[PDB]
Design a protein around this ligand. Structure first.
Ligand SMILES: Nc1ncnc2c1ncn2[C@@H]1O[C@H](COP(=O)(O)OP(=O)(O)OP(=O)(O)O)[C@@H](O)[C@H]1O
Ligand SMILES: Nc1ncnc2c1ncn2[C@@H]1O[C@H](COP(=O)(O)OP(=O)(O)OP(=O)(O)O)[C@@H](O)[C@H]1O
Lengths: 130, 129
């Protein structure tokens, strides 16, 4: 049941469930990603011409994996989608990944309830960042 | 009854219970200290040189640093400051703060809740800074 509302904004940000043109792909891509972790580089590619809806499709995959965090036995954490065109011209991708990964780790550090657990893992994270 | 062993070292650090001489003053000073805060809270221990002031004042801190739970009033005592063994130009406020900071840092490292530890640590360092 895919119902496209033409008078809706119909933008990658505003696209939700039940009006995603690509839904069989989204369902099967998530399962393939999960199975590759349950069992080197593990890189998936989603191809398509310009305007095919890559940004709309890949955001749903991040949304699909983010939902039901603890419920799924295989746990995958998704960083926010990186857009190479909107990044600074000379800013490295490894810097972008770490900066987004650091915030995800940092917000988890602020979520602990044990002082020693938070204190010990904070310096380990800072040691690797250094 | 107090028994002094002349073959013992008989030093301020090597004086224990039943060997300390002025227990009557020590017992009534610790209680007097406790009632002073249960209600310029400065007490003075007078004595001529060689009367045993260091031995007496070490026991008062030793007595006040035990069985804190039973007594209604809780007093935390810094290690005794000897003004003659400090550096010549170091202010007393620096010496007191540097010893107050350690026990606080030992208390912060003793917490279990990570949120309480974080909030107090930045509050403490704000005063220190
Ligand atoms: N599932 C969908 N439901 C409704 N409209 C869609 C859907 N997928 C794509 N569209 C429409 O097609 C357009 C294609 O834009 P989209 O960003 O998804 O594609 P892209 O060209 O691969 O990405 P980018 O903007 O990053 O270049 C959207 O702006 C939207 O108007
Ligand atoms: N309670 C005590 N029991 C036994 N001997 C004591 C006692 N108090 C003092 N003395 C004896 O007197 C000596 C000097 O004591 P203490 O060091 O306390 O003297 P003070 O002059 O008050 O202080 P300071 O040593 O800092 O000048 C001890 O080393 C010991 O020989």
């Amino acid at each position: 049941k895919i119902i496209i509302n033409l008078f809706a904004p119909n933008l990658p940000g505003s696209t939700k469930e039940d009006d995603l043109i690509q839904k069989s792909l989204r369902d099967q891509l998530v399962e393939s990603i999960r199975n590759s972790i349950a069992y080197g580089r593990n890189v998936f590619f989603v191809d398509g011409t310009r305007g095919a809806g890559k940004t709309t499709f890949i955001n749903s995959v991040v949304k699909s994996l983010n939902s039901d965090q603890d419920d799924v036995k295989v746990n995958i954490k998704c960083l926010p989608t990186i857009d190479p065109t909107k990044l600074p011209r000379h800013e490295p991708i490894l810097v972008t990944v770490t900066a987004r990964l650091n915030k995800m780790v940092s917000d988890k550090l602020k979520g602990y309830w044990a002082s020693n657990d938070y204190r010990k893992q904070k310096e380990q994270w800072q040691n690797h960042l250094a």
